[PDB]
Amino acid sequence: FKPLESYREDFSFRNSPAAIARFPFPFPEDQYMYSVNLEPAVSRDPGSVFEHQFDVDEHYVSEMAERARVLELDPGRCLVMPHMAQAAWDTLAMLMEHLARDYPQHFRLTRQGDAWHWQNLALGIDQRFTFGDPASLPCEPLEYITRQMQGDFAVLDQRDGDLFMDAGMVTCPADWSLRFDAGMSFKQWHSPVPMAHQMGVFDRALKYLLNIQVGAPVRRLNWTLTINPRLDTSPETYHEWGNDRGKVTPDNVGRLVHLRVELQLMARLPRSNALLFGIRTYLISLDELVSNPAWAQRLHRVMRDLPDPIADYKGITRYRQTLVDWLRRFDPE
Ligand code: HEM
Ligand code: NA
Numbered sequence: 001f002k003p004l005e006s007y008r009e010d011f012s013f014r015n016s017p018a019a020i021a022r023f024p025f026p027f028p029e030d031q032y033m034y035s036v037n038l039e040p041a042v043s044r045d046p047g048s049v050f051e052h053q054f055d056v057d058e059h060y061v062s063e064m065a066e067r068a069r070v071l072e073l074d075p076g077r078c079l080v081m082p083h084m085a086q087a088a089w090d091t092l093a094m095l096m097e098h099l100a101r102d103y104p105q106h107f108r109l110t111r112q113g114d115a116w117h118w119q120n121l122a123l124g125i126d127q128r129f130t131f132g133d134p135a136s137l138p139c140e141p142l143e144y145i146t147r148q149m150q151g152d153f154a155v156l157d158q159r160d161g162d163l164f165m166d167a168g169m170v171t172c173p174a175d176w177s178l179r180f181d182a183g184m185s186f187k188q189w190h191s192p193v194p195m196a197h198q199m200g201v202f203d204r205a206l207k208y209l210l211n212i213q214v215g216a217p218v219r220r221l222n223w224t225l226t227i228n229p230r231l232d233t234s235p236e237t238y239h240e241w242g243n244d245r246g247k248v249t250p251d252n253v254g255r256l257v258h259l260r261v262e263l264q265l266m267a268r269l270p271r272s273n274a275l276l277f278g279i280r281t282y283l284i285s286l287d288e289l290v291s292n293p294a295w296a297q298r299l300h301r302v303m304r305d306l307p308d309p310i311a312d313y314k315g316i317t318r319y320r321q322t323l324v325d326w327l328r329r330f331d332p333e
Helices: 017-021 060-073 082-102 141-146 201-210 235-246 293-305 308-314 317-328
Strands: 078-080 107-112 115-120 125-130 152-159 162-169 218-227 257-268 275-285
Touching: 078 082, 078 141, 082 107, 082 115, 082 141, 082 152, 082 162, 082 275, 141 152, 141 162, 162 201, 218 235, 235 317, 293 317, 308 317
Parallel strands: none
Antiparallel strands: 078 162, 107 115, 115 125, 152 162, 152 275, 218 257, 257 275
16 A cells, blocks of 8 residues: 555545556447446456455555545435345445455454454454444444445345445445435436437346346446546535546646546345445546557547547546547557
8 A cells, every 4th residue: 555645636646557557448449339248247367456356456545535535524425225224234244254355464354143353454443343233333334344445335225126226335426426316226327328228238237237146246347537536526526626627738638637447346235135336446547548558549549439429428528639639649540
């Protein structure tokens, strides 16, 4: 873990060369289109973001500080409807188990029955508590554990042939809000997305997700762009970030425009039968990205050719031409 970085204000976040090398570049082709891009979330490629179910990286402490600031300002970024309390404990069990197995240098868990002892050495936390007893922890169980893992989480109730957004911790969204979406069903919360409904992507995806079983989790990548390494690109805080989309120039694209990738996990939670949706968010500046000339060339092509409704949906419209012109320099054809 490097020195504390910000994702707001002075934007001190930056990637080491190792963090650049493992960035999850999301484009298998020189153009992008929506699809059901799901695969089994099996461990692969040691050192990569796909090695473990939950990826903890160099920015862990910085990010947890960012989460804490968001929640200090707005505790309503975390919501757990009462029927989802068991699912919140399932989520805390899954995260603590995997973190302690995969990063034993940073996390430890020992248990006897419902007497659990969790240590997070990175954050100086040493907690003895009662699994299932929310008065035993300093806050509600989903908030407790997600204050200690990178990325956002939604917890979906599966009922009546659908998924319902009935709990979550959403502090680094790509321009959406859990308080807006609370209680919505799968196709409903997806209503603003262009193209993909008519394509069948959401029908097919819902069907795959409803069939997810314990021990066979699934993953996909999503992406967008963000100006500055701003994690909290929420409706709630628009006045703090939306203006930056007018600040891109030919001279500053490389330092301002960031590629944002979401490594998404869908995992069945074993007591409750709920579905955990992890949204692990990676950021890389274009100066960093173009370190890799194959990434640079491919991003030029993607951005030049991206369907306008998809560009508009992603919020790239205002700076897209400047961006495209800048990236063209890295594309020998
Ligand atoms: C339960 C699991 C999922 C949750 C909770 C979730 C949630 C969301 C939310 C809240 C948005 C933003 C909508 C907005 O603009 O207000 C979104 C966008 C999107 N979702 Fe999902 N989603 C899930 C699963 C999937 C799956 C399996 C696919 C498969 C393709 C998918 C594809 C998309 C697409 C294509 C967009 C537009 C993203 C972009 O263009 O950057 N989602 N999702
Ligand atoms: Na294809």
